[PDB]
Design a protein around this ligand. Structure first.
Ligand SMILES: Nc1ncnc2c1ncn2[C@@H]1O[C@H](COP(=O)(O)OP(=O)(O)O)[C@@H](O)[C@H]1O
Lengths: 336, 20
């Protein structure tokens, strides 16, 4: 994979250095329905007029971006997204801006969030969990090799495509950094203890998050939960983990190594890096090449109606998309 | 059970990310 990654970095760097800009405009799309929301924006199902293709259009109010102090994070998101390429990363198809909004148009992944299916089904069996986990492992290997840290892993940000494979979305907290960084960001249940403790951290926080995701997929609930974020952080920092009775010995050993408070001992962060995870007994049945090639048969295939079907997504309250005749925050988002 | 305690908790829906 060393020769693959070296070429992958070469491809990535060209686009990182000279980013795509202004590859569409709003009136090229008909907005249909909201697919999901986050603290500052919504993702809408749209239909592209000239092609007839459906896409997921992420809309960011520039004023809200600024208010929540997310200018650099939003610039990060777009710059990274337009430069990456991997089978399990949602593709950015177009991006643009107008007087009021930033727009990131992605491929529409109709199978819905892993979150919905996980909560509905209750929990995934270990092979089912392993199938998804493997894709995240390879994806993080790819991202980290590019000096990228992801920082927002959770079932809400993992979409199931028509083949039952994972598409990672939401690069809102993604950042290109060599060495450590300090921003307190992510989702409380998925925060590594070094994020909470404000001491600076590196890509090993993504591996901790992988442990949290694997646990939640396999248990049906997270390893650290409570009614309030501050209560969750207390449990994370204690580091005490308890496993369901049905967890295999192999799964528990892997999780102890991922949910490891000690950075000199956390899997993924050691001398042999990602190979400590890839070669773990829990992944013994995993053909890593077959996964990458999408040749492994998926355990779950979302019911797929029409190309613009949203039946795998919850309904959200709609809201008009406003565009002022006055340009807002022009200089701030010049590079977008 | 842990499952029951989770299901009765206030954080079983989609979880918001945090910044600052
Ligand atoms: N490519 C896509 N296909 C289908 N749905 C998507 C896609 N991208 C995002 N979504 C939906 O939108 C939700 C939130 O997107 P996100 O990037 O978190 O926006 P924000 O940064 O505003 O929070 C996701 O949880 C998902 O349900």
């Amino acid at each position: 994979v060393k020769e693959f990654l070296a070429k992958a970095k070469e491809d990535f760097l060209k686009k990182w250095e000279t980013p795509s800009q202004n590859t569409a405009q709003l009136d090229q799309f008909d907005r249909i329905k909201t697919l999901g929301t986050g603290s500052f924006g919504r993702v809408m199902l749209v239909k592209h007029k000239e092609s007839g293709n459906h896409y997921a259009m992420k809309i960011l109010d520039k004023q809200k971006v600024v208010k929540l102090k997310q200018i650099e994070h939003t610039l990060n998101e777009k710059r990274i997204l337009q430069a990456v390429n991997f089978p399990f990363l949602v593709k950015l198809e177009f991006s643009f801006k107008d007087n009021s909004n930033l727009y990131m148009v992605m491929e529409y992944v109709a199978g819905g969030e892993m979150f919905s299916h996980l909560r509905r089904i209750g929990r995934f069996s270990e092979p089912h969990a392993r199938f998804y986990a493997a894709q995240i492992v390879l994806t993080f290997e790819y991202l980290h090799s590019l000096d990228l840290i992801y920082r927002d892993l959770k079932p809400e940000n993992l979409l199931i495509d028509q083949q039952g494979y994972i598409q990672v979305t939401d690069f809102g907290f993604a950042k290109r950094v060599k060495g450590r960084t300090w921003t307190l960001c992510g989702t409380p249940e998925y925060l590594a203890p070094e994020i909470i403790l404000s001491k600076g951290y590196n890509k090993a926080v993504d591996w901790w998050a992988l442990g949290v995701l694997i646990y939640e997929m396999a248990a049906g609930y997270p390893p650290f939960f409570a009614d309030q974020p501050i209560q969750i952080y207390e449990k994370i920092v204690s580091g005490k983990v308890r496993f369901p009775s049905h967890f295999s010995s192999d799964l528990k050993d892997l999780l102890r190594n991922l949910l490891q408070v000690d950075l000199t001992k956390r899997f993924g962060n050691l001398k042999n890096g990602v190979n400590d995870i890839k070669n773990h007994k829990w992944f013994a049945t995993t053909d890593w090449i077959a996964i990458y090639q999408r040749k492994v048969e998926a355990p779950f295939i979302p019911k797929f109606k029409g190309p613009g079907d949203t039946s795998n997504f919850d309904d959200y309250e709609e809201e008009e998309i406003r565009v002022s005749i006055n340009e807002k925050c022009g200089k701030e988002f010049t590079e977008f | 059970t842990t499952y029951a305690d989770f299901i009765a908790s206030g954080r079983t829906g989609r979880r918001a990310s945090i910044h600052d």
